[PDB]
């Protein structure tokens, strides 16, 4: 109890206060707490009621932060009785209670961290992920002075044991006294009170009289603080103080202040993770022998048995595990017996059974320990008298390797992994194949990302991986067929999900057979094939996870490098009065631990306040039923620590690429030629149901190579079934329903006959006879007959037989009066789908067939593979027949209506621009701007919206017309009602056109329009409604002022119609006209402002009342067009950081692979650019902070800001003065009644500003209290820049001092405000400094500014006084300007920066 008091006194510890009413960080602490709480629900889609209820409660809290804090502190202050806690060990605590608990947890950890309550040796720590801790600890041992020497008979000892039942035996009166030392006692009382509650195991309800409930959100804090008591008992006050270092200046983990104190004590090193203590002792020979004797006294070993029951590390070979020399063994127990004695059985239970003591000595060259699931063996380089998972331990003094650390995965963690896997197979179902593979992948990745190089060295874990992978595959195979396959194509398992594969990741030797690498393509010219050829093993191998994860050592070495680099870069930026820029570090973005990327994330500022986050995450196991396997890293704090995207690419390549992979699937049967990816909370965690998966892969699964001995033919079809594969037979029965097989055959035969009738004269055909054939003939797969018989004006001279695309058949040898056609259908598999080889074999077999009766010897057999959508023909040919059939077959395959049905049916089973300028009159409909709003997010968040006019944008792409219907505001479950209104209007337009002009297609930019518009267009069956893939920038139509103006003014519903093209068709073709138009529009989307500079920038070349665009020349058009053309991509370069690359266009695709970096005076253009600065008003961000009645909010009114930015500039700062008089009955409240434009000098960095204005003459100047100045800037910062500060002294240090700085940030599209309250120390510093032009200057410090409450209203208007002269801007008249002038004033209208005179 008092070991803690002496320690806290020695540390001069400052107890944590009850959270103040105006606690600085309250809103941050609260949001972190609540975000933790929400996170459980982030993944899941449908929440049941308790989940659904709890979320409602969080959102309330978050919605009213101020009231919650009140709400919360009341409980901490007063609430000492609490609801029961359910357990299952996982504990469920009442949700309303949790919020207070979580707030409490975040507040304590932040405050304790600030106050250095927990010494460097306590772990887990926010400083490092566990594998990095294990690295640090092994290095730290390496660097102890003279540690590995054994010249003089010295020993080193590493004791590792558990503090048994530490949590379970906590006593509450003790705990309360203990908490009171470090915290407010209203808080100490809540915490212990909160542990004393009823625990409901489902039936029993029992009271928790003692012991810590690890489910409580702040239990982690108790546990570590209570641990510290035990650390102190183990270490004693002095050694603890040596390790920790002085309170004013403390000691980094395992660092000492001087070599002398390091050697001052037997205990060189100490760490606790959390329940587990590690202690490293050094002994000289007597110090050891001496200690062994004291121990051997109380526990003498007459017969030398102390070796039996001495825990050892069995996972190392017998030579590399500790050698049981009697002396070393005895020393081990002695350190244990000494240590054990220092801790009361009340505080914990320490037992020999759960401890491992490793001794390094002249007889033991290996130091062993186990930490965070790694087993570690250190062998010093001297004693080296086995290449896997090795860390080189480098001596910091000598810069040389002095030892090696060897790693393995612990047996206990290998079993955990094996159980996870067995559990996947074990889990109940009925589980989809994809689900099983996902579970496997998660287990695998979880293991690999954590253990990394340790896995390679651990052979039993390697074997378990391999068994596991096989088991996973084998469950999929059993699901597919009761019978186990002879062979199974790895493609089905390892093909990624995007291509319909299970997406398994491999840790095995999986050989891809060469027979699985073949694919084919049908072209207009012919059928063409690929077969594999020669390769080295490992072109034949499914890629494995091993090589895709950087080793911990490499990560750590590289982290040391890059973080040192950043420090250096940080050094210099400061030296040049600059803030360090992202790009400067780009290319170290994804390196380091934490990642360098963490420095530039947005939430960076708030994450600063998240302390205890590593321990917090580890403790979720107690309060959440299902948790992440990545509990050991946090992406917010750490960044992303692995990237496996490469694996996906490499697997696809290893399997033969997209074309080879899809050959195994039914993809070709869809009729699609090209692949582009469209199978079907924001995100998709979607999984393929087995029915679809099995159909997709059927060609490769349902074949003779995979399954034998059970071949049958499916009734009413030519399909063969190679086994009882679940759901496949029905899938195919459905696809061929209504006798489709039979009908396809008949329909194709009919098409052939019709074409032949057209060619009677030209080919000398006397007659074409359609034979009538047995009903089931289409699917007799062993015999056939003629379908069409043909006859002859006179005679035909015919080739011996050759295939439909063989090219010099010669017709001499033969003659006959009669030709026939046989149409054969087949349904192929991966093993067989060579229609060419198939028709030849069939033709040759059947014509010499003594059961197939054909009329003549001459004939042609045509073959279609229904599964693969391929065709070919074989037989005798006469002049001009072959080209007819070729063209014919080519047309029938595309158009035939029966085949179309087969394809549609197949696509349903699977759950699956040049045109635009053709004759068909087609329309585009965009409704993006139909119902549109403006937004007023309060600091709090009941976020209203106001509805402003909108437009239906309907356009004829070919011909450029525009029917704009203005959706007046009157008209208004609202956004949905938008769709139905649009559909109604479009259908009404269409009714008005007569059928000549009615569109044959309407294209909707947005998918949600499809249903409303079909429904409204039922009366127009001939009009297709088609959605699109493209992203089309019509939404940007309201960046066109003529348009925006008509809608916005508009006072009623109207149809106003234009020609967006503007006569370009005059010269230009429609295709192109679009292309400009798209260009014009995408740009505006990108920068409303950058774009419009390009068209008001040369006023003389100008726009007639008729058109929406300047009346440009054609070249400059070619120039204007030229500039934008890059810009789309710049926005691409800037946002994605890609400089230049292959010329692939960007209308439809966001991104693709790099990353090579290949290949090695009337301006007064401004006065334009400042024309367009009202744009920047569309979005205002006012910086905000928690209200206080005592600290007070200033208010600004609209017009004042409206002009101010109106008269502002785009690059150069501008400033003024604000006059405020408190509202009556509102002493706290302040209004910005007047702004005073004053003569000034402005710089991008800085400004020179005239002195406080005398309002004294100018009228009505009366009753007004100055509050301050307000200024613009082009760099956002969170603080007043050095220049701002300099200008703050300069006019407030006296007399008033107090007046605020309002800084405005102008960046295209938005304006961002902030107000700061200057400190005196600021006040002093500037007064030291004049003529500042930089944001950062030596001695400049941000702390000086404080926040002052700010607001913004429509509710008022203010008055502006200009200088009596009317001149305020002296940038171009620097010499005229005197900063110390006396100047007079008048009520007036201000003037823009670039008013003509300035």
């Amino acid at each position: 109890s008092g070991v803690m008091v002496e320690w806290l006194e020695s540390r001069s510890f400052s107890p944590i206060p009850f959270p103040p009413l105006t606690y600085k960080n309250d809103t941050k602490i609260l949001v972190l707490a609540l975000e933790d709480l929400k996170d459980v629900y982030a993944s899941k889609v449908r929440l049941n009621a308790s989940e659904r209820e709890e979320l409602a409660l969080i959102e309330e809290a978050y919605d009213n932060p101020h009231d919650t804090l009140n709400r919360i502190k009341k409980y901490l202050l007063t609430q000492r009785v609490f609801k029961p806690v359910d357990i299952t060990p996982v504990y469920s605590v009442d949700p309303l209670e949790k919020i207070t608990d979580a707030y409490l947890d975040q507040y304590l950890w932040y405050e304790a961290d600030q106050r250095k309550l927990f010494p460097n040796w306590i772990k887990p720590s926010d400083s490092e992920i566990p594998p990095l801790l294990v690295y640090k600890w092994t290095q730290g041992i390496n660097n102890l002075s003279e540690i590995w020497d054994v010249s003089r008979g010295q020993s080193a000892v590493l004791l590792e044991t558990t503090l048994g039942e530490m949590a379970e035996k906590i006593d509450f009166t003790l705990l309360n006294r203990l908490l009171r030392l470090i915290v407010d006692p209203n808080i100490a009382d809540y915490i212990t009170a909160k542990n004393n509650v009823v625990i409901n195991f489902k039936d029993m309800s029992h009271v928790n009289k003692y012991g810590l409930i690890r489910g409580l959100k702040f239990a982690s804090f108790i546990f570590q603080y209570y641990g510290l008591v035990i650390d102190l008992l183990l270490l004693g006050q002095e050694r603890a103080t040596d390790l920790a270092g002085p309170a004013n200046n403390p000691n980094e983990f395992m660092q000492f202040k001087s070599k002398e104190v390091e050697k001052a004590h037997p205990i060189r090193l100490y760490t606790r993770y959390l329940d587990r203590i590690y202690m490293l002792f050094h002994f000289e020979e007597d110090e050891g022998e001496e200690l062994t004797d004291e121990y051997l006294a109380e526990n003498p070993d007459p017969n030398f048995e102390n070796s039996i029951g001495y825990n050892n590390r069995k996972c190392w070979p017998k030579d590399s595990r500790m050698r049981l020399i009697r002396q070393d063994v005895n020393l081990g127990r002695a350190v244990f017996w000494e240590i054990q004695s220092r801790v009361p059985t009340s505080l914990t239970s320490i037992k020999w059974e759960n401890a491992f003591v490793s001794v390094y000595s002249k007889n033991n060259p290996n130091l062993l320990f186990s930490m965070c699931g790694f087993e570690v063996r250190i062998l010093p380089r001297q004693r080296m008298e086995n290449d896997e998972g090795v860390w080189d331990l480098v001596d910091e003094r000598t810069k040389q390797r002095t030892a090696k650390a060897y790693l393995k995965v612990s047996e206990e963690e290998i079993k955990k992994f094996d159980s996870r896997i067995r559990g996947i197979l074990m889990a109940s179902g009925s589980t989809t194949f994809t689900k099983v593979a996902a579970k496997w992948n998660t287990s695998l990745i979880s293991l690999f990302t954590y253990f990394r190089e340790a896995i390679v060295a651990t052979e039993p874990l390697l074997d378990i991986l391999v068994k596991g992978e096989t088991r996973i595959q084998n469950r999929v195979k059993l699901g597919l067929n009761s019978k186990m396959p002879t062979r199974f194509p790895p493609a089905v398992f390892y093909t990624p999900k995007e291509l319909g594969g299970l997406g398994m990741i491999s840790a095995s030797h999986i050989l891809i057979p060469a027979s699985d690498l073949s694919w084919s393509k049908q072209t207009d010219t012919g059928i063409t094939h690929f077969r594999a050829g020669m390769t080295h093993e490992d072109e034949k191998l499914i890629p494995t996870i091993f090589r895709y994860i950087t080793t911990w050592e490499n990560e750590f070495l590289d982290s040391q490098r890059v973080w040192a680099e950043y420090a250096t870069k940080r050094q210099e930026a400061i030296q040049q009065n600059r803030r360090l820029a992202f790009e400067e570090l780009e290319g170290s973005w994804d390196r380091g631990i934490p990642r360098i990327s963490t420095l530039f994330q947005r939430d960076r500022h708030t994450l600063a306040y998240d302390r205890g986050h590593r321990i917090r995450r580890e403790f979720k196991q107690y309060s959440l039923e299902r948790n992440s396997p990545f509990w050991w890293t946090n992406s917010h704090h750490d960044g992303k620590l692995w990237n496996l995207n490469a694996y996906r690419t490499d697997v696809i390549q290893a399997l033969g690429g997209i074309e080879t992979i899809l050959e195994h699937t039914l993809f070709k049967g869809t009729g699609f030629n090209s692949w582009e990816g469209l199978f079907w909370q924001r995100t998709g965690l979607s999984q393929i149901p087995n029915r679809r998966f099995t159909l997709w892969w059927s060609p490769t699964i349902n074949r003779a190579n995979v399954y034998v001995g059970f071949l049958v033919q499916l009734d009413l079809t030519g399909i063969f079934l190679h086994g009882k594969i679940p759901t496949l037979k029905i899938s195919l029965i459905q696809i061929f329903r209504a006798h489709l097989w039979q009908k396809i055959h008949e329909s194709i035969v009919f098409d052939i006959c019709q074409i032949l009738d057209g060619e009677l004269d030209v080919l000398q055909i006397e007659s074409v006879t359609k034979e009538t054939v047995h009903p089931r003939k289409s699917y007799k797969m062993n015999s056939s007959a003629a379908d069409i018989t043909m006859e002859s004006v006179h005679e035909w001279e015919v080739s011996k037989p050759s295939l439909l695309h063989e090219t010099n058949d010669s017709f001499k040898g033969l003659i006959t009066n009669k030709m026939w056609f046989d149409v054969q259908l087949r349904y192929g598999d991966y093993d067989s789908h060579d229609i060419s080889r198939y028709v030849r074999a069939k033709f040759l077999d059947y014509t010499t067939d003594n059961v197939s009766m054909y009329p003549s010897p001459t004939g042609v057999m045509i073959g279609i593979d229904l599964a693969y959508n391929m065709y070919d023909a074989y037989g005798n040919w006469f002049n001009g027949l072959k080209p007819l059939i070729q063209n014919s077959m080519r047309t029938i395959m595309k158009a035939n209506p029966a085949l179309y049905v087969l394809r549609e049916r197949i696509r349903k089973g699977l759950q699956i621009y040049a045109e635009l300028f053709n004759n068909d009159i087609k329309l585009f409909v965009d409704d993006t701007n139909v119902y549109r709003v403006t937004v007023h997010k309060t600091f709090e968040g009941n976020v209203a919206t106001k509805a402003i006019n909108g437009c239906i944008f309907t356009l004829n792409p070919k011909t450029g017309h525009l029917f704009l219907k203005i959706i007046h505001t009157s008209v208004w479950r609202l956004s949905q009602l938008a769709k139905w209104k649009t559909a109604e209007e479009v259908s009404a337009l269409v009714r008005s056109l007569p059928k000549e002009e009615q569109p044959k297609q309407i294209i909707v930019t947005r998918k949600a329009m499809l249903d409303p518009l079909e429904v409204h267009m039922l009366d127009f069956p001939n009009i297709a409604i088609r959605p699109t893939e493209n992203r089309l920038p019509f939404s940007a139509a309201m960046s066109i002022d003529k348009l925006s103006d008509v809608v916005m003014k508009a006072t009623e519903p109207q149809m106003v119609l234009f020609n967006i093209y503007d006569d370009w068709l005059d010269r230009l073709s429609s295709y192109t006209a679009f292309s400009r138009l798209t260009l014009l529009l995408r740009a505006l989307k990108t920068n409303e402002e950058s774009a419009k500079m390009i068209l008001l920038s040369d006023p003389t070349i100008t726009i007639k009342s008729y058109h929406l665009w300047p009346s440009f020349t054609d070249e400059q058009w070619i120039t204007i067009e030229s500039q934008m053309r890059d810009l789309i991509l710049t926005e691409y370069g800037r946002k994605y950081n890609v400089n230049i690359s292959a010329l692939t266009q960007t209308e439809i695709k966001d991104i693709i692979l790099g990353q090579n970096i290949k290949a090695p005076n009337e301006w007064r253009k401004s006065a334009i650019a400042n024309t367009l600065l009202y744009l920047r008003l569309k979005n205002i961000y006012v910086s905000a902070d928690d209200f206080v009645e005592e600290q007070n909010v200033y208010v600004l009114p609209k017009n004042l800001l409206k002009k101010f930015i109106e008269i502002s500039d785009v690059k150069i700062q501008v400033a003024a003065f604000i006059y405020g008089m408190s509202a009556k009955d509102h002493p706290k409240v302040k209004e910005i009644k007047t702004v005073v434009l004053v003569p000034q000098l402005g710089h991008v960095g800085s400004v020179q500003i005239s002195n406080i204005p005398d309002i004294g003459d100018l009228p009505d100047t009366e009753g007004l209290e100055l509050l301050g100045w307000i200024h613009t800037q082009t760099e956002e910062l969170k603080f007043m820049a050095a220049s701002e500060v300099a200008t703050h002294s300069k006019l407030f240090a006296d007399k008033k001092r107090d007046c605020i700085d309002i800084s405005i940030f102008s960046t295209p599209g938005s304006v961002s405000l902030s107000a700061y309250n200057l400190t005196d120390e600021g006040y002093q510093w500037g007064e030291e400094n004049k003529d500042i032009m930089n944001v950062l200057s030596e001695g400049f410090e941000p702390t000086f500014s404080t926040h002052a409450q700010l607001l913004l209203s429509d509710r008022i208007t203010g008055n502006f006084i200009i200088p009596s002269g009317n001149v305020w801007n002296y940038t171009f008249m620097g010499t005229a300007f005197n900063q110390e002038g006396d100047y007079n004033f008048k009520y007036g209208i201000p003037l823009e920066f670039y008013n003509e005179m300035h």
Binding site: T442, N645, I733, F736, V901, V930, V933, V935, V1015, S1183
Partner: protein, 327 residues
């Protein structure tokens, strides 16, 4: 009552109502007896061969004496009616008397087949499946529906004449009520379908139940479609007769309960089930069905694995705004 089998030529799995059993090749199986008289029944076949579709016969014992006989020419078992009672009345007892005939069981606690067929009527069946010569109805896995055939002779008896349901059609949508009728399907349900076609709730339910059973037993595409459509229609209607609503949850519950696991991803329609259960007007009226579905088919409904690797249409378009925030 009894259904004799003249022989069992080929190895086949035989189902009657919710029960199934196998017969080996030329095992002496001469039929089923002690069939409860009250119900429509179905007897269905799948050959162990695997060449065959699922096929079967719906019948009513009261309308005739029915027997099964294998047809080698066709290669399947066929139902037939023995017009002469004495001759038929003769065949059993040689088979009952010589045993060789298996007994339909005596009912489980749940009274299951009745719950599945409570509204199904054979005379309605016979108008859906039109083969006027016979008193029993043959259905198999491949049969399309009249709706599908129209929206594209074959034997008209090989088409299922279910009532045509199409949610974007003139019949469903009144001109001048396009949005209203599409978002709330009550007009289509109540006026067009219940008042106009079925005439009764019981008729609507009967078709729905028949469609489900054909979907389950035969894995018939059109049937599954119809079943789901008939469910969707009710759930997507804001106004439904109260007695129908009460009834529906029970109807669906038994169907889902009786569904064996293997036929689930074949039958069930992800979209429709998630709509009806979680966003439809009548979602609350399906308490029991929701519970069983969540238990039997959680994956279909979204119940729970990590990211390995590493819109706004339903919101207004934002012109511009006023925002209070940190940075």
């Amino acid at each position: 009552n009894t259904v004799p089998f003249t022989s069992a030529p080929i190895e086949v799995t035989i189902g009657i109502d919710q029960y199934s059993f196998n017969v080996k090749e030329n095992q002496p199986f001469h039929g089923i007896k002690d069939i409860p008289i009250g119900h429509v029944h179905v007897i269905h076949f799948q050959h162990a061969d695997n060449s065959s579709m699922r096929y079967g016969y719906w019948f009513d014992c009261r309308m005739g004496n029915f027997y099964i006989q294998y047809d080698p020419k066709d290669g399947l078992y066929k139902m037939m009616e023995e017009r002469d009672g004495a001759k038929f009345e003769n065949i059993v007892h040689n088979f009952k008397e010589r045993q060789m005939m298996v007994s339909y069981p005596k009912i489980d606690e749940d009274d299951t087949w009745y719950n599945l067929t409570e509204f199904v009527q054979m005379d309605k069946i016979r108008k859906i499946v039109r083969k006027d010569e016979n008193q029993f109805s043959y259905v198999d896995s491949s049969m399309t529906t009249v709706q599908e055939n129209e929206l594209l002779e074959d034997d008209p008896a090989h088409s299922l004449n279910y009532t045509v349901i199409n949610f974007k059609s003139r019949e469903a949508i009144r001109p001048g009520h396009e949005m209203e009728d599409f978002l709330d399907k009550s007009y289509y349900l109540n006026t067009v379908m219940l008042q106009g076609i079925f005439k009764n709730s019981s008729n609507y339910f009967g078709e729905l139940q028949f469609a489900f059973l054909n979907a389950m037993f035969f894995g018939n595409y059109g049937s599954s479609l119809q079943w789901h459509a008939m469910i969707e229609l009710i759930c997507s209607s804001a106004t439904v007769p109260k007695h129908m609503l009460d009834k529906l949850d029970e109807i669906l519950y038994y169907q889902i309960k009786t569904l064996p696991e293997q036929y689930s991803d074949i039958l069930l329609n992800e979209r429709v089930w998630n709509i009806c259960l979680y966003s439809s007007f009548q979602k609350n009226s399906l308490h029991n069905t929701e519970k069983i579905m969540e238990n039997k088919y959680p994956e279909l409904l979204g119940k729970d694995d990590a990211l390995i690797y590493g819109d706004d249409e339903h919101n207004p378009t934002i012109v511009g705004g006023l925002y209070y925030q940190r940075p």
